[PDB]
Enzyme design. Structure first.
Site: not given
Lengths: 179, 178, 177, 180, 179, 176, 178, 175, 183, 177, 178
Positions: K56, K85-86, K110, K156
């Site tokens: 997010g 991700s985060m 990513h 990714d």
């Protein structure tokens, strides 16, 4: 909403009442209920009505207005953020001498702003002009000004700084801090 | 979607002009163009304006109305199905003596039926009331009736049979056949 | 809603009942429930009915209306902001002598305002015309005026100031404080 | 989508006019326009009006109706598929003796079926009841039947086969083909 | 909803149960739940069932209906505002002698109101006609009238005043006040 | 255009759902071809999933009303009313291409008072019986057979439709 | 659509027929009509059926298929861009020896891909399986392959280059140029 | 009309996205011009952002199948399948106007079971490889250049497209 | 919801469990939860399962069904208003001798009805799974009703509405309760 | 949701945990949280995990799966209604010997269901998941990996007895006996 | 949410904080609030940060990140289900030696993904600063080179628990306790 009571009930114990956002029948009647309750709890203490409002329904605002004048306590008004349209109307309606604005508040006043047979449109147009005239007369009384000034000065949106609202007669003082 | 012989252009050669459905700016201007063309083609022959309309824009109807009275040909009007609101206005505006309805058509007349600052709302309310008075004014002259009758009789929807419209002065005759 | 018991329950203990916003079945029945409760709590002390409403359902207002007259307490009515359509009807229905408006309230009265076979449309149109006459007769009695006055004066929307509602017989007094 | 020979213009000078689908102002006036054209082309020849319609606007239907009776040609009517509501009214309105249905056609008749102040609703209710009575009386005249009969039989939807519509008096003959 | 117990729970302590608005599975079962509770609390005291309803689901209404007849307390009914369709059915179902209306109540009765294969449409049309007949028969029993009367009188919407519903046999008395 | 050119060869197409508009366009073409020559056969090509019963009936009675024999050909599919019109062609001149499909079923559609729903349900049941009876005549079969075989969707190959009596022959090419 | 006649009617005079985009009842019947016209115009000259299609309705594709086999002209097929699902079926259905692909065409074959009572779902699933088997049987005949091969090779989407489609038997030659 | 008029000059337009319908309209005009005159050049004017790859392939194989040289001219832009079609014009007769823009990139899907997803991803990778090989042939460049240079959107001016090998000359005016 | 414990929790103290409205995973598990709670509180006293439902998910209904038969208390069933589709199945599954209906209840039974794709392979799999469900339900229904499976297959081909008396004669319930005296 | 404590909180005092409906991040973490609480409340008593789910997110299901194996209590599983896709995986993951199904449950197992560079990455990640799932499922059922590859290619519906014979559950429970 | 004290407040008393679902301003600040609360109740015992997230907002996640590093308690991290991700960034941000994944967890990292040209320039430059900053912090968490992170986050990059451990993103894989 944080708890302590929720935060607004806690400040209600300090006789602080908020009008935030648009003036609706529901939000105005909620203000009326709080004013009536504070009168019952202590009719001999001032009430502090904090207004951050863009305005809204005129009849809803009148219900607050007539209650402000009906109860025994002085209703002191404070503009924080802005008091526009009915928001400015109610702010100017505070007990004279106890109408306040924070230094970066803004006030805005203007004339009323808004289908059927011509007969019906005539009726509602007339009623709309009646409200506009009543508001100008009440507003001039609050500001201790001439009716012609209010008619001219509300034809379109009239934004005022806190200092300008004071010279206009809408408020009494600008409050920097407690001092 | 429209047969060839097209049928409406073909009936235009018979000096027949149709107003069908609501009176809008393009449909009204289409009538004006046909009225102007038929005057150009033969200014000495009558035009037959067949109206089946529930009404619509008042200014659009005025463009037809003033054009009917501007050109030299008599504009005879015939109500088929219905002439309501501006439709009844235009029908009543036909050349006196040449305003007709078919036996089961119906006529309806009424006062005009329709945001901003109170100043603007006042202004547009004034204009709507002027149009309403103007319409009663023209209508009473069309009906050879007194202005008070039209004010009273158009306050709400007033439906009339062909025979009532004749009694009212809105049309001259009912045509069963030739 | 601030808690003090919430603000409205607190004011209910002083026999204050609010009608705010449109009159629907549930907004009306909540009032009926409060009226019945206050009668149970003390059938001999007046009830104060605060009305700020644009109107709404005629049958919903009728349930309030008959309840106001059924219970033993006098129901005093107060118009704040506005009382329109059924709101104005309920306002006028308060105990005679105890109907009030705040000085910048407005009152509005009018005739009733609203598919199928012609038979069905005939039935419902006739029922609507019965309702219209019933309201005019009841309104004329509340205002102590002739039925002709109410029929004529409710043909289109009729806005009244507090004093105009006062001459009409719709309220008894204007309360400044 | 309409082939060229367009198909309907070609059949138009066999003096055939079609009413297909709902009766609206546009669709009704297109019929009116065609009726007037055929009368102008030959006022002494019959017109053949083919009706496959579920109904629609009564005033629109009246424009066809009064036009059928206004022009000089006999307007023969033929029901194919169905003629319901104003469609059945128009079918029944053809020249007496020249009203027909194909064998598996269907006819349906019923009373009229459709906001504001009570005064306005009163006005439009009264007008709707005028139309209902007017339609029943005109229909009884088309069918050579009693007004009391049309009032009873149109209170709710009344579906009739071709044989029933013929016995009701709505059409004159059932056409299976060229014999009949 | 106010507190004093919330307002309806407290009126429930006096054996008052409300039916307000459309009759659905959810609103009908809540009535059933209240009826079962009041009988459990005291099977020998009357229950007072206040109806302000436009009607709704027939099976949902039957759940209330059969519950009124199943439990031991008499279920007295009062029409306030209006009792239409299934609202009128339940009102007429109150304990005979204890069915009431307020003076400006209105009553309305009518026949039932509402795809697939023809086979399926036939089944549901027959079931709908079964419901129409059953309801007319139960209504005629409630009103002490002939089945033929109810068939005639429910063919289209049948609006009745309080006096008309009393004379029809749908209610027993009109109550202006406690007296 | 291509369809008007084929119309001059007395070929009329029914493609897609049977509506008032699509059926009456077929009717107009049938009447036109009769006007041009009432004594030559018409070839009615059907690729349709079905649709309105009254719309298809207007085609049906026109096929039987006019003087030309109307030969029918199913290409792709003839379902429900498509299958009814296919079955309605001049006996001996109803055909299917080899990989066509035929499907027959009972009528498939209510909102009003119970009185009205009664009226419309009975009217739907009359239609169901009428269609089974006309279908039984087209197929030279019993009404009892049709009632049993249309209760739910009944899909048929060209050969099955031929043995049922719905068509007369399967055409691989014009070697009949 | 440029005028030359529009461009597609002009190419019809060269006996060119296109299938472009999804196979629908309307798009398939448009092809059927063109095939019938070219047979009428000259039953003894080849027709050139150019296919760029992702597939679509099986019954609509069958109307083209049986018409191809019904008329007297040989129907030669050409894949440009792609022939997938019914597009590939029709391509493989051209006159043997006259099925072609352009060099960067792609061919894709697969089994059929798509409410009510359980009785109805049974009927429609069983009907869909009949289509599955029939298509596999016809495809095996076009490709001169055993039915088991087609059942195995169409279980999921099977993309083929032009050379792969030739080697499968789905087309006869690959055309780089004239 | 104006476009039929220019068709008589053997000018064929591709404007806007490459779809099955818009590509086939181009294919139809190309075949029409070949039949009308198989021995005169065709002028294919491209102002396109790209679109369907298989649709673009149908134009491509038609350019190479017909007998006329298909000369290409980029006006406005030739992006994705637009640039592919431009580069596929007859070698020596691919042109751009001076402020044209060209853009090339790897296949992009806008918008089942893991088995099916495997099949479709592999087919997309074959397409990506096929396009790179075809592009490298058009550009007289190494396959390795096209694979790296199309990994993300690569915008080129007319000079750059010429230096890349995508076109042959830049045409300022009729000289 | 009125409070006295809210009204439904209060009736839960009397071992009354309600199923109102459609059978979902959500509503079925709430019923399953109450059934297990009552067994835990008292495994030797009857549970009263009141059903007013139009039906819904079969697997969701199956979770209630198997919980009724798995727990030790007799689960007596009462239909009020209606029990249709899975509602009628659950009603018929109450402890034999303790299935009831109020007099104007309605019962409806029918074969599975799906509303709302894939390869024919998948469609073959899902169609056959639905026919297994249809057969399984008819067999359980025939056992509940103590009648032949051929009766249930014929009688559920289309929607089959029954009155309280008809449901009893069919074997879906044991008794009709007019009031407590009717016992 | 009834009160006795809400009904689900009360059943947690019996060490009952439900998974109902789709497996999402939120509903799976709610299950994870309850597993952690019951282990905290008593790490030596079994937990009873009732599954009525159509499946859902694989990573969400993995968070439940690894928590079942991380905590000290045996996690017994029960299928009521259905355990499909990730529902069946979690059911099969209960403590060997304590995996159960009610008699009319159904079990279903099946395989899992930008630029071309990105589509390549995500497709191959999905194939790894497919591979992972077949291998763990094979361990749960004490079966050949090849069997799970064949039997999950398309939707595989099993009765309770079939799921038991497959090795996905240990026993079918008709009642407390 | 069951009220044993809902289930999450009750695990919060055990110093367990969850991040589930997307990282938003709300979802991140709720985490920040619990982190500060746990420090206030006891600044000397570890906190256990359970992460099941697809990623997010970068600034929202940074608020958690700087708070984890700001407070006195060691923040231990556990990846369950997935950390993407985060989510993966925060997982990597736990106290060195105390970052864990459950055995069938997944990690994915990513590069970042999302007016006038002047404005678009400003926001593009700001987006590229974020990309480099995140790569630099990630490289520090993993004890790896910035060059590795730039190459490994370009698209990714999905990692098993073992791969994430070998990368330096986590310290230990826990099937059960240590």
């Amino acid at each position: 909403v944080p708890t302590v009571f929720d935060i607004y009930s806690r400040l209600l114990k300090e006789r602080i009442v908020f009008l935030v956002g648009p003036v609706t029948d529901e939000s105005a009647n909620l203000v009326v209920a709080q004013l009536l309750f504070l009168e019952s709890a202590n009719p001999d203490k001032d009430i502090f009505f904090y207004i951050n409002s863009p305005g809204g329904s005129v009849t809803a605002g009148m219900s607050i207005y007539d209650t402000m004048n009906f109860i025994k306590p002085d209703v002191s008004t404070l503009c924080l953020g802005q008091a526009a349209s009915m928001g400015a109307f109610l702010l100017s309606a505070g007990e004279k001498g106890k109408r306040f604005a924070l230094p970066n508040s803004r006030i805005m006043i203007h004339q009323p702003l808004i289908g059927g047979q011509a007969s019906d449109i005539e009726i509602h147009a007339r009623e709309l002009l009646k409200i506009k005239e009543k508001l100008n007369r009440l507003m001039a009384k609050h500001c201790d000004r001439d009716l012609a000034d209010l008619e001219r000065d509300t034809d379109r949106d009239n934004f005022m700084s806190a200092e300008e609202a004071k010279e206009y007669g809408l408020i009494d003082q600008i409050l920097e801090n407690r001092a």
